[PDB]
Amino acid sequence: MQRQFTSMLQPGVNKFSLRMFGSQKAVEKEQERVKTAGFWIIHPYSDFRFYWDLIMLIMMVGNLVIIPVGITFFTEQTTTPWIIFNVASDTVFLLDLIMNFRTGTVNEDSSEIILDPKVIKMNYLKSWFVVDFISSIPVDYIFLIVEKGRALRIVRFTKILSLLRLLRLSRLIRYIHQWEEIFHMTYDLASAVVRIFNLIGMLLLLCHWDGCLQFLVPLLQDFPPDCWVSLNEMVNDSWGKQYSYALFKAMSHMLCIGYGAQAPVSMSDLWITMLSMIVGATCYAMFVGHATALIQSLDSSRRQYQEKYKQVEQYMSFHKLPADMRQKIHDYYEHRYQGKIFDEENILNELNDPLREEIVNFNCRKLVATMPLFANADPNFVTAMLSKLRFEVFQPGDYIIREGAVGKKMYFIQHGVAGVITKSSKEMKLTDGSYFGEICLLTKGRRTASVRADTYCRLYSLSVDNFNEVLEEYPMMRRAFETVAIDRLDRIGKKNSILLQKFQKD
Amino acid sequence: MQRQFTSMLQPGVNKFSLRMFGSQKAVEKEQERVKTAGFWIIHPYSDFRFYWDLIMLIMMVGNLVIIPVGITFFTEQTTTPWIIFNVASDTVFLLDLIMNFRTGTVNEDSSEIILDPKVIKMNYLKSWFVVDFISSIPVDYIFLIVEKGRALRIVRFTKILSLLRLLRLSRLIRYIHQWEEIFHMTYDLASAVVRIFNLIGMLLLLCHWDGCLQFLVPLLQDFPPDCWVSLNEMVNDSWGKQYSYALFKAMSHMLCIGYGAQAPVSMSDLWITMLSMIVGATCYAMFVGHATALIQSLDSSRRQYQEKYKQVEQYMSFHKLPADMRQKIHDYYEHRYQGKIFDEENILNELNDPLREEIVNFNCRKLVATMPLFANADPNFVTAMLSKLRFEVFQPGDYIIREGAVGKKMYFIQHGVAGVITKSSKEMKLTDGSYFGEICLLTKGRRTASVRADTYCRLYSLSVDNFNEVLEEYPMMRRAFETVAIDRLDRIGKKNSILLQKFQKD
Amino acid sequence: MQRQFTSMLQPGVNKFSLRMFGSQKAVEKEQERVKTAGFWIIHPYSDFRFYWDLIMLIMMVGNLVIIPVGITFFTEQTTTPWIIFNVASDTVFLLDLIMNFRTGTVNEDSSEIILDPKVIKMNYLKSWFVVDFISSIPVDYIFLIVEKGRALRIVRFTKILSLLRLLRLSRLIRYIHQWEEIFHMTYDLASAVVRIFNLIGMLLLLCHWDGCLQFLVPLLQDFPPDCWVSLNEMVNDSWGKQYSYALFKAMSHMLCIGYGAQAPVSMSDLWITMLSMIVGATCYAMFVGHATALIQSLDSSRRQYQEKYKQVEQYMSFHKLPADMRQKIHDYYEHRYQGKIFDEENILNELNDPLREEIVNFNCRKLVATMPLFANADPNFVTAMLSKLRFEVFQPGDYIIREGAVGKKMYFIQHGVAGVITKSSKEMKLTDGSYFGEICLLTKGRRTASVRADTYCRLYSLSVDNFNEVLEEYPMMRRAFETVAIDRLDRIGKKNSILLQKFQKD
Amino acid sequence: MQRQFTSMLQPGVNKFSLRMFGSQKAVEKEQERVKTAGFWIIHPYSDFRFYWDLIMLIMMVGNLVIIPVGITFFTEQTTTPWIIFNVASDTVFLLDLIMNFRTGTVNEDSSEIILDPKVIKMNYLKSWFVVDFISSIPVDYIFLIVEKGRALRIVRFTKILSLLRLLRLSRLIRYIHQWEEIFHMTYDLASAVVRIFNLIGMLLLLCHWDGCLQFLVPLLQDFPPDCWVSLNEMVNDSWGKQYSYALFKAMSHMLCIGYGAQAPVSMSDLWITMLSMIVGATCYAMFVGHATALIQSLDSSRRQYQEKYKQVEQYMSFHKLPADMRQKIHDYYEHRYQGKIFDEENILNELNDPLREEIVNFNCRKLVATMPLFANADPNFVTAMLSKLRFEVFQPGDYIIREGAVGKKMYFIQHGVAGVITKSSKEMKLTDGSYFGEICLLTKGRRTASVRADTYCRLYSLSVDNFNEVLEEYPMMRRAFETVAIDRLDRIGKKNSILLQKFQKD
Numbered sequence A, B, C, D: 001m002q003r004q005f006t007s008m009l010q011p012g013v014n015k016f017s018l019r020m021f022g023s024q025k026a027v028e029k030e031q032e033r034v035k036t037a038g039f040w041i042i043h044p045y046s047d048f049r050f051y052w053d054l055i056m057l058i059m060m061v062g063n064l065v066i067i068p069v070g071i072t073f074f075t076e077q078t079t080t081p082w083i084i085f086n087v088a089s090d091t092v093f094l095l096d097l098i099m100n101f102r103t104g105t106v107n108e109d110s111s112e113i114i115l116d117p118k119v120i121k122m123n124y125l126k127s128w129f130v131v132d133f134i135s136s137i138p139v140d141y142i143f144l145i146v147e148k149g150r151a152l153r154i155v156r157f158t159k160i161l162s163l164l165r166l167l168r169l170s171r172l173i174r175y176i177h178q179w180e181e182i183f184h185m186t187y188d189l190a191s192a193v194v195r196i197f198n199l200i201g202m203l204l205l206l207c208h209w210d211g212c213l214q215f216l217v218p219l220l221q222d223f224p225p226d227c228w229v230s231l232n233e234m235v236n237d238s239w240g241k242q243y244s245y246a247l248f249k250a251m252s253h254m255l256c257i258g259y260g261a262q263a264p265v266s267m268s269d270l271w272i273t274m275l276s277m278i279v280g281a282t283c284y285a286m287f288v289g290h291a292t293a294l295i296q297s298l299d300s301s302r303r304q305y306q307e308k309y310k311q312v313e314q315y316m317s318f319h320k321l322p323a324d325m326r327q328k329i330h331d332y333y334e335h336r337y338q339g340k341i342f343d344e345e346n347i348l349n350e351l352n353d354p355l356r357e358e359i360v361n362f363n364c365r366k367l368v369a370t371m372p373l374f375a376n377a378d379p380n381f382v383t384a385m386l387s388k389l390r391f392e393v394f395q396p397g398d399y400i401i402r403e404g405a406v407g408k409k410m411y412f413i414q415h416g417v418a419g420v421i422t423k424s425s426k427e428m429k430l431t432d433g434s435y436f437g438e439i440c441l442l443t444k445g446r447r448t449a450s451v452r453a454d455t456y457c458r459l460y461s462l463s464v465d466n467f468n469e470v471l472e473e474y475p476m477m478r479r480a481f482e483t484v485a486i487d488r489l490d491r492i493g494k495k496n497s498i499l500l501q502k503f504q505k506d
């Protein structure tokens, strides 16, 4: 029913509307703002405005292609099918002029949309209306009717008047730059791709119009004996032969190849050729510019990784490091970053709490399932530890811990193997999902066995200040870490007295 | 009166003068520095200096266009209108040489302006004066007068001497690069735009001069039978026909199209053509360079947003995240930044206190009007809270708070809806302008109800260390937050005893 | 034995496999995942897959070169050696189609490899299979056999059908982009180098195919009197003469030089020429793009140093600094960075503990050998100091210390000379490997002698908060620093009483 | 005497030597390392090595220009002046081969210079020696002597052999890339400038050699009737006519203009032309690349300021700020940075203590002279305050202080005027060199008068934590600030009792 048509002129509820205004409670307020204004106003983001702009764009490219050819290569632009086509394609561009008095303008000053008739009618007439009117009315047929109540000059002047219809190109530029931002906001296609597909449309269009101009000036001069058409003896050839040749001549100038058969011979030809050369050669330089901007946007991640790693060689060479040590540094960069560039501490800081909580669970589900102390704890404790772990990598043969130092960290093994070493201990191994380094952080003493990486291993580490911050909020968990610690100190025979005293009569 | 003319040579009070010197008390000191020097000195930023440079620029472009044509395509450069024009356009360029002995030089060493006659007269004569003198005096008419007390060689040598007037191009370059910096400091037009509009002027000028040189060498050789003018049989054609052809030949070399009618046939033509090809092809490569520099400056913001967001996909793929979780991360980036790139904590830190105080009020006038605790407080308290809020966004279904955790934050709802959930509570809702999370920060206990986002919502958050820092300076406000808190704990039935005890007999 | 062949289809243990999966325990798990699937599956990183792709690439470039020539410049493509060659080079491209039903696809969604037959057969047939089948079967000989049970049109149509074999270019693009990533991950060649060597292959190939197309259309039209072959009178010349000319014509369009002998004369030639001009001129613009991307990647370090140092002149000119002070600042930047750009505090922070411990030893072995207090200490103390030193540089004549200030630092001399100055002290010198500034940090008092650089010297410095943090963990070392300090205070005669009292009866 | 010649082969003491090694004590050690080696060794940075490389470069460019012409355009390369010139220019390039067995190689591995004869003789013969020998000996005259004990083929083969002398270009490339780094380290000319002046040398040289090749192949074929020389009828013209034409043809291909008179007619010409087109068009694309790299390095500072300020408009538009507030923000950025981009807190942190102390005095000599409390203090106190000041700017009408707030800062007026306002106070003014805000920091109370900017003013500010840190080290200075404070509180009548009590009986 007609109420579904009355709903087509107000703003919609597609994801663009939500991105521009926020929640549905902002969209439904702006939707009433329209309905409570004057008798009809079209919202610039309405489905009606958007389908109208597509109907215009599809028809307007057709008109900017056909009109130059129908003016240039034909006599009798007052015959039946041309009178029908130019009348029909005048009405739609005149309805478009009417609807621009009743469309709400977006403001570059970032306000709410102007959305009122007395503001819109004043804002439009002070801008594009002078070009929009001249390009809409049939000035050539109006002039022909006024002059209707020797004669060959009238056919030349009405040809020159009819070319005012090319000013539609202003609407093609205005409607693309608005319609493009809606698609570019919603569908995320890259800047240089969109800019190139606009510029390829302009190159072909300027080239097509030049390929008409190069024949139109000879025609308005009545084919003088010195011009290219008369020297090539092609005044009476079919229109497709003449057009194919004039377009070849026009794009030969643009791509800088030559000028067709021979160099210009007359004054008109000389000055049309130079204008075409300048417009062509300055337009192809803008294409080389956009091609360069495209190519440099595509390798961004690879380039930034190379530009980062080249800076490490500046440091290694300034300190004059040995060639085997350079290899350990180069190899570590492959195992820690896998050729990808990012800054984890910068990205994780822009996300809110509940995304950061979800990502930091997914990286660690192997520990949470495999390791016994997390597997039965309250989930508000497990998320209090996993949010404070930091990620580290060790190469085979490196010591993570040495005996007789102090403090700072403990480690959980995400992947790989680490060995535990002490006097008279023989040897011992820790696999994936286990943890080490807790004794120094509980007892406040020195370290009691060395630990060494047996394969390329991924560890998560927890610092002494963060470890106490978690356990002070959950004192039931400290007893679990202590009742594991006292058992490990029994196997190694170290039997430390302060922890054994700290457990008694709990 | 004449004192208004004597005031024209000293520095003005337009916004450039204030930007260079600071307050009016610096400008009025420099204005006396001029007046207290020698009998007359012109300040380089004076309105007289600036209108004199415009009179020169407008006339100097006219001379560098007309002089090559009047030398090349004409005999009789001693006829009445040429004697009048070259005399008149000699006097202004000789007055310009006089005023450069009395203009204060700007120093590249960033000092005060040199502004003294014995320093200026020594600094000028050691630099451009040798080129400025040769380009100002009528050397060709002086030579013609000296030789005045078979003959065809004198007309050739006086043509070659008269081309010394093209050295004016040094003044055109010097005066543009100074005059441009005043406009570029005051009106803020972008680097590549200004640099392109300078280079387009040089391309057309070099092309025009080459289009004269290509005919001048044939003329000084008296049109030998092998040269392009004699082979094309155009020795006696009108000057406009000859010039249009010679310019077409010159720009055909620059844009690399061909060489006109046919390839060179003589020694002079061969070496003029190659010089023109090298100057042309190296000059068009600089245009492609500036076109590339322009295009890459225009998409800066879009590009940097793409280059930022591409780096998040490096992180999500390194951690091998699931495809539905990638969608939550992608969607959050659209709701928090709306496709715009900036760093709020870096920009706000460069502004002074009273700008930062004004911006942080404008973002929050909705809270300050709608919420009851700010609406009657002292404005020095309200500005003490709003300056410490941080901005956060939550997606629908995410928990902001869970029961049985601890501390850190409280939240004010700028836009959207949040629901409050607890055992036997049924359900409850908070709308725009309200606040939650205060109970944990006042009581120092654990949380007492969960809170969950019901629509895409914008929150401002306040941390526990900043919350106590404000309330310690305004103890009257803590009573308001507590007398709301005790009422909310009654509705949920939790009735916490420490806060109820803390209120008694105040 | 055949088990070594059955081992060729599973993943290997070369450094790429370790980089993709981690330790050998991840590789050996994926290696069983393959063996435990269906009867045969080829892993995409297998040595069999990689040698098969090389056999295809080497043969496929040969086919995309020979096929256009054998179709264009020859009659009798049913003669003995062509029947042998096209049959043989059909079988290998049909075995390749069979093995793509049994190769595990890599997933762009970063999962484990799909590695199952029912998933692979469904994923392939929904994508490239339609082009892979058409390019593999001998459609021209199949059509010739079907039609085998006036005639000149069949030879033209079988020429047009046989060009379906050029769709192999899709396999050449697919196989390069996978095979390249393995080499680019393992051997680290830069982005723009690899991208240029791909594009040079496409330029020569498009140019070769265009050089066939430019003759093929005349041949399919039976050499009409208006076309370039008939006007140049070369219908009966040897095939090498015709091909050399048609390739010259094709690359003349691509590099924008001309069009061979003369401009086109017929409708076919005009539209083939314009298509060749557009494909050529848009392809050469992509080469200028990649050449620009290469050149800007090579000077990265030099450029960034210039772009950094230019920013210091913005600061020195904003503060209007004197010209001799600018020279001290310029000279300091040469002695501290030696023209190399890096950020030491950012690089050292990405490395793990045991690399950072090794680099910070290598920079200081001169101190550890030459200076007496480190040379006999426990290595866990020496590594506790060297990990907290910071690096500084001083110009000759600058004071490092003044008498009568307080605290902050002490210094170790890596290289150069410093002099010690005090009232009635005469003069005194410290050489490489010595240290100064300890008295203020031990006694908590003020400084007691000035110190001044006598040559461009490199110092390591230690801050007062870090100095106490080390000595609190190793109280035996504080006695060494104190028993040196009390001896130095005796030579200068200052004899400070608090330190002398602090030593008694230890 | 000869000892001054023996000193020419060891390293010097010019600023490059100091930049590479550090102090003179490193240079004088390396200088002995040379003298204590084998009988003679040339150090690569010696004045002898550097003048020898200049003698080679100047002569080698002369040989790579003359040799192609003397081979191509002349018969009788065994005549008197050619035998003299080729013998002489063989000896110097053979002495150069001898001295490369006795020059110390720089190592790309950043070690000390290899500087020993058994290492150098092994390292050279495994690299460039094969090309250095072939390019040094007169192979053509050796072959002519061996063949010396119908004949026209010997003159063709000795022409082809004599072109081996062009391999000298390897020495021209090797010697430039070493000699350039010494100048580029010492004199600081920008990357793209140096790279362009190298590439312009290669363009002219390749173009010159191509202009010889284009005539040499016709000559070795004995001028066949189809080639360009015979069609242009110029077999007997003077050598300058032939060379000028062949160079025009060669650079017409490089700059893509045409191919001279007409398109190629024979097989040799066709394949020489295409090789010249490919070498030319790929070499001009590298010039457009370097021209783009030059132009983008020159506007670096202007561009970065625009790219910074464009990011502020992203922030102002995301918050939808009013248009008058945007103007205050835009205007503040002009008064605080004056269109220059830097980060003061990053630059000042890279300088050592005694530079940072000197710069921070020069910015403040106006305060230190004009203000009474600094003007008589100990210089170790004045440098303890000035090193902790921060710089701020305020627009006219903004409040710096409001009554009834608390703490944080005090201010010193570098330039401009500020007014002091209170109830019943009338009005009061502070000029340049005075200070305000001390009462709140001494008394720990609230503020007691408002302060407002009366002109665009520059302030230095000091924070409460830094203020107490200075005064605790210099308790005599706190009495000065207090004895000013108590006098100011008397003028305003506030008469605060805690400070008045704190002064009694000192």
Ligand SMILES: Nc1ncnc2c1ncn2[C@@H]1O[C@@H]2COP(=O)(O)O[C@H]2[C@H]1O
Pocket: A401, A420, A428, A435, A436, A437, A438, A439, A440, A441, A446, A447, A448, A449, A450, A451, A488, A489, A491, A492
């Ligand atoms: N026998 C053991 N079995 C397993 N782990 C042990 C054993 N003995 C010691 N450890 C661990 O080795 C760690 C070495 O560093 P810490 O002494 O701080 O803590 C030690 C324990 O976590």
